Amino acid sequence: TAAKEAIKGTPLEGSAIYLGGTAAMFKDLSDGNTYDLMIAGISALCLIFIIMLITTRSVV
Amino acid sequence: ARPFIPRMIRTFAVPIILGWLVTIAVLNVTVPQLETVGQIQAVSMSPDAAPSMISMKHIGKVFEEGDSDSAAMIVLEGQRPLGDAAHAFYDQMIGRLQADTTHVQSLQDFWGDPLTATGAQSSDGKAAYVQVKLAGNQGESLANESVEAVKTIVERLAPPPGVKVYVTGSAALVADQQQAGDRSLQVIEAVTFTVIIVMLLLVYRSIITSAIMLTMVVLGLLATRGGVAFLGFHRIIGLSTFATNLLVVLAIAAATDYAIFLIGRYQEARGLGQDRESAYYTMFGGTAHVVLGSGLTIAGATFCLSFTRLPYFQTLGVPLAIGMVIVVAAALTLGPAIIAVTSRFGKLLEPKRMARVRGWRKVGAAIVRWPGPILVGAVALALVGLLTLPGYRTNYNDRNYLPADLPANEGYAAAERHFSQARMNPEVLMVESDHDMRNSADFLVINKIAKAIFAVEGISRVQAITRPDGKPIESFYLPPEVFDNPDFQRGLEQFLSPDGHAVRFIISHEGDPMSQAGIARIAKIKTAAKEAIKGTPLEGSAIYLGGTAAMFKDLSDGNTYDLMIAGISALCLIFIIMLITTRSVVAAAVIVGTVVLSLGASFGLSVLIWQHILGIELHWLVLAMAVIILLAVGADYNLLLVARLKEEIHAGINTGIIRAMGGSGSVVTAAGLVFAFTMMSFAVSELTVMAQVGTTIGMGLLFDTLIVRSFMTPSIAALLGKWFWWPQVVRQRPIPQPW
Amino acid sequence: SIGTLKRAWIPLLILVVVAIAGFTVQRIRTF
Amino acid sequence: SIGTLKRAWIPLLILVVVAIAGFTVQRIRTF
């Protein structure tokens, strides 16, 4: 954000900003981690609900 | 014996019918229509005490540019970079625009001066714009005819080849929105009339009873429309287009509820097995006080809506209250009279194939025996509705809720092809100090203010006297001999005050300036200016901010305070009318809690459907109209259901639940489905706002009628048992009588 | 007396509700 | 009808649950 507001007004407005390193990698992994934990939790809980529904024939 | 009011209405039925018809004819002949009296007697939509309106009036007063906030822009674009033909067209056009006085008062000529020409031209040179400040506040008629006059002045002449012209701005947006709302009421009305007629043929399964019920609704609607038009035309009360729209939709709602209530009670009474006269007298004695109390508590809530601080809601309460009084009077006198005269004319209103009653008694038998698990299921569906409610956003930009064929929209598209910003909706910041501002050090302070405003995250351009193009990214100095060149003097009259006691900056945002972020930016702008003036001899000035986003932030703050005020007033009136009706405080508390929970769950479900699945945000008028209409109708059906429940409790509480359900739930759900699908068929509209409002009301009331009022209130009643009627001492069941 | 408190409990309760409602609405009106 | 719905409520409920689950997972994978 600091780079993006630094290039404003000057004739490099609209350039491409690329950032890399260990910290950027770990931020991408953490964001992906929370979304993918949500996905895995949904799939696992749905499958447990399915197998308990076939086994017992009851929804409660 | 026999009560006096129904006997009086019954005996004198046809004089009442003829008198009502004559009154409706007089009010709809000698008085013009509601749209015309709304147009000629419109009001402003912003408060006079709002800081944005005060700032805009003060900016207009200091620079001597009128007393209006409305503005528009003229945009010229070409497939080639613009040349001297464009200059000649621009000079001639601003000459003929300055010729007009009674419609346009101000014109910010920027492209004429070569100093600010670079600030009034595109990067590639294939676009230019000029701002014109018109007459009349926004929401008034005068701004609309000013827009029409300026656009026909522009269109009257032929542009040079390769160069095209358009009108843009917020005034053009509201004028084209009024035009679009005028011309988009034919085919959606066709599908609405056919879905109403198929819904009534489904509910009543007859062509005669539907005809009488439509006669009831249309006569009540005409009477209400004529009465409100009479009271507004002779300047007794005030009116608005918003007021007439909400008035007509709530009038149709209340009229069809009362008509379905009276007809359903009469048909149930005749289906019990009694003759046609005592059936009329028992339906009167059953639902007349119900209609009276429901109509008066809706009228009281809508009157208490007038104690607020927003012009969208101040100007609405008295018209709704008066219109609801005419609706109650019509449904109480014209309704039973025409029911009586069509009853004794011959065989017209007949019960046939009564199968809803037995099914709803089966549902009542199901809810009595197992209140616990059914209550858990209904609360589970409610919690399904409620969990998406905390995540909810809004948008204030009205361009993306309109069809793309409007001339304002194609002007916006032409502006967006060459401009990377939202240059069509600027903001004006004035700083007013108590000394003359033609000085070099004060100019340094002005440059400091411009630089400080420029550094706010989201602000793309600031135009000042120091840097007219919009790039305050250099160190600035100015020798004092510049005060002799007449072109710099023209710039000084353009930017500074004529008396030299005020300075203005023109601010252009990034992306969408009417989004939530665009609302939040302006407080940071004012704060940045305030810490920019600290420590200078200019410290202690008056900072005014005007524009579209300032107006919308003011409206959103007023919206949330007004929502709290109207909610407290409405819930207190609901508690009061339940307290009179039941003589029970716990039943009133149960009903109020059920109403507020049902409203929250329904609005959450609507947010889930629109914002998450379809992918477009909701408006804020949709929330306002939804809560008003659903509050009114929910109070009505809840009062009728609770009154029918109270009516028979002496033969047990559980038997009371099943008998009240089989006697009232069918009528309540018939009215619910009819009005819900009538509002639901507005979804085919090319106007996005009214489609959103219609389908939000439709799905919310479907959730209200199918789950909350059918499976949650009787479950709580049967679960609490005889503690539903505290303080009154009532038995769970009567004394066990012998066989 | 207790007769004047238990025979007019509905009007007194309504009066308390309207009083606190008007107080709160007048308090929010000045915001 | 009533018979074909109450006879096979189990495969219908597994179908509805996996339908909503697939919709949600396909929504989250876009992120």
Author numbering:
A (entry chain F): 740 to 799
B (entry chain E): 20 to 493, 688 to 952
C (entry chain A), D (entry chain C): 1 to 31
Report text from the authors:
Bedaquiline, an antitubercular drug that targets ATP-synthase, is a key component of a new oral drug regimen that has revolutionized the treatment of multi drug resistant tuberculosis. Clinical bedaquiline resistance in Mycobacterium tuberculosis has rapidly emerged, primarily due to mutations in the transcriptional repressor, Rv0678 that result in upregulation of the Resistance-Nodulation-Division (RND) efflux pump MmpS5/MmpL5 (MmpS5L5). Here, to understand how MmpS5L5 effluxes bedaquiline, we determined the structure of the MmpS5L5 complex using cryo-electron microscopy, revealing a novel trimeric architecture distinct from the canonical tripartite RND efflux pumps of Gram-negative bacteria. Structure prediction modelling in conjunction with functional genetic analysis indicates that it uses a periplasmic coiled-coil tube to transport molecules across the cell wall.
Structure-guided genetic approaches identify MmpL5 mutations that alter bedaquiline transport; these mutations converge on a region in MmpL5 located in the lower portion of the periplasmic cavity, proximal to the outer leaflet of the inner membrane, suggesting a route for bedaquiline entry into the pump. While currently known clinical resistance to bedaquiline is due to pump upregulation, our findings that several MmpL5 variants increase bedaquiline efflux may presage the emergence of additional modes of clinical resistance.
